[PDB]
Design a protein around this ligand. Sequence first.
Ligand SMILES: Nc1nc(N)c2ncn([C@@H]3O[C@H](COP(=O)(O)OP(=O)(O)OP(=O)(O)O)[C@@H](O)[C@H]3O)c2n1
Ligand SMILES: Nc1nc(N)c2ncn([C@@H]3O[C@H](COP(=O)(O)OP(=O)(O)O)[C@@H](O)[C@H]3O)c2n1
Lengths: 313, 302
Amino acid sequence: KVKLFRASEPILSVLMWGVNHTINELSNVPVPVMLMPDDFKAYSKIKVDNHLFNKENLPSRFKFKEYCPMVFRNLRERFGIDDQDYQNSVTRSAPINRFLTTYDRRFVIKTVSSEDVAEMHNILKKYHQFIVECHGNTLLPQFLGMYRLTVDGVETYMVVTRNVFSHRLTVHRKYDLKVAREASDKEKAKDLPTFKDNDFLNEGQKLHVGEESKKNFLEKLKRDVEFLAQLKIMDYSLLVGIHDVDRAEQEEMEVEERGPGEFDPSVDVYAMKSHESSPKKEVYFMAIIDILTPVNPEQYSKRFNEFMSNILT
Amino acid sequence: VKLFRASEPILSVLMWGVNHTINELSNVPVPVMLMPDDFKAYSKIKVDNHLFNKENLPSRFKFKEYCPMVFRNLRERFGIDDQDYQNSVTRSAPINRFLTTYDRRFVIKTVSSEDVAEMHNILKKYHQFIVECHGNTLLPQFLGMYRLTVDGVETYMVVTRNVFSHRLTVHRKYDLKVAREASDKEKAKDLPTFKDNDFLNEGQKLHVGEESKKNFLEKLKRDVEFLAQLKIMDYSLLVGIHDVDRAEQFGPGEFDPSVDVYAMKSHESSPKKEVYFMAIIDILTPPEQYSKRFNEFMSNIL
Ligand SMILES: Nc1nc(N)c2ncn([C@@H]3O[C@H](COP(=O)(O)OP(=O)(O)OP(=O)(O)O)[C@@H](O)[C@H]3O)c2n1
Ligand SMILES: Nc1nc(N)c2ncn([C@@H]3O[C@H](COP(=O)(O)OP(=O)(O)O)[C@@H](O)[C@H]3O)c2n1
């Protein structure tokens, strides 16, 4: 039952301690009927000065700040995520890979800037309104928590989201789609490259999701990018991951010498199975990412939507 | 859901803090032994909330625990489970500075800076004594020492186990330590703390028998010899009497000796049927001869 908070770097130990602490505190606060405006301006701040005490894995001195915890608790709920699940994914064992996921591949933690935190604040009220109006059905990032860590006097901002990719299905290819950009030879020659727009058009990959799936997808994406434009946001990308059912079927047995393509929409919410009549058996993960940035954002909406339309069947 | 609702805000912080520290402690393993740094150690946390969780807590406060490994171990050596300790302090606000937990199981006393200094001066020898007598002792059982800062003003507290039964109403009180007696002022309260002389005037005796009295005396002698060997004085013996029959105006004169650890039933050959609670108190204010006179006083009462 004993959480040690052991991690490779002290900041991660503090991250685990902080999420554990704040979720436990959150469990003694009742759940409100609605959020009040003050809930959107609030924060929790704790400052720890231990001494000759509990130093095995944590620092003796550190600080942890959580932003709008009532709000992200509500978001967590509206996205179908249990607080106990959230805390466990972050604390049963250290996250891994600044860019991290929890041990269980369920959630992503990104280090971010002061400015990103500011923008998140400027948009949070309208974003929560959007999430609730669409019952959480959106390809936008699902923000579950925003925290600030101070260790060795250095502040570090982090934003927690749900992973776009399946937490079980191996992802075989990745694209970042938003002028004309392509993957550097440097990126092109690494373990799993983020292949930009130009490489996707060069390769001629299309995604065969089947009529009904494609339509629900495009309706959802149109609602979302129009929201982003109405918030005067741009430079956002659509993230795309390909899982090859048959290759996975092989490797889970090739390591064995030493359902297939089945997934849970309650967990892998951006996942989509390939059309029954498709060249190969694939699973796709597609969602919008990178929306805290702030040439025209209206034209951004229109161009982005036309491109993403022309990448599906 | 622990709301930490309390009578005065300092009590809310006490509840939050003991809750916090006991939960943190449950993620700290139990060491093979205590090390010297454990006797110099401390936990310190500082809270600045804002537009958040202000219903029952303050937005800004600070909480310090002294020697958490030691007091946790003491707790164990006194037969006290950490989760129980935490519940008694947090399931419901303490009551009536002098406090007990809602369930009347532990006493929370405000104490001075100097008292904290003294507790530190003695803690290692005291813990060693606790372990040497397997916790069977009449000395105060220190379960936790904490510093609270709320509105920038610090408040020190020591938690100990209660002398009296947490269920049985106690009917008369004597504080035995020269010549001290109860003032007309003190004499005119609901339960007076009647000092040494008035108990001898009243002519109440306590009939515990022989075997009971004998083992009791062995324990009292051990304790005061320890306190002398540490050059401590001005300590008092607290004694409370429960007269079952007055209570009659589920169980009568019934208690759990694992819980009311200082209780004793009266001898069959006794004036009335009584239950007695006896333990040493106020041992933080720093001749030896006090040991001998004190123990002699307590000798002639069985
Ligand atoms: N639109 C908006 N609304 C808010 N409600 C809000 N809140 C914070 N930001 C921004 O990010 C930083 C947050 O940490 P803060 O710097 O504020 O944290 P704090 O000031 O306590 O500590 P420091 O002074 O030791 O850094 C701020 O400086 C801002 O750049 C906010 N932006
Ligand atoms: N699997 C998965 N699930 C998520 N929820 C998720 N969210 C963000 N990524 C990552 O965002 C990174 C770029 O991040 P981006 O915002 O473009 O910032 P830059 O790196 O350009 O500064 C991409 O390479 C993705 O790996 C995610 N990956």
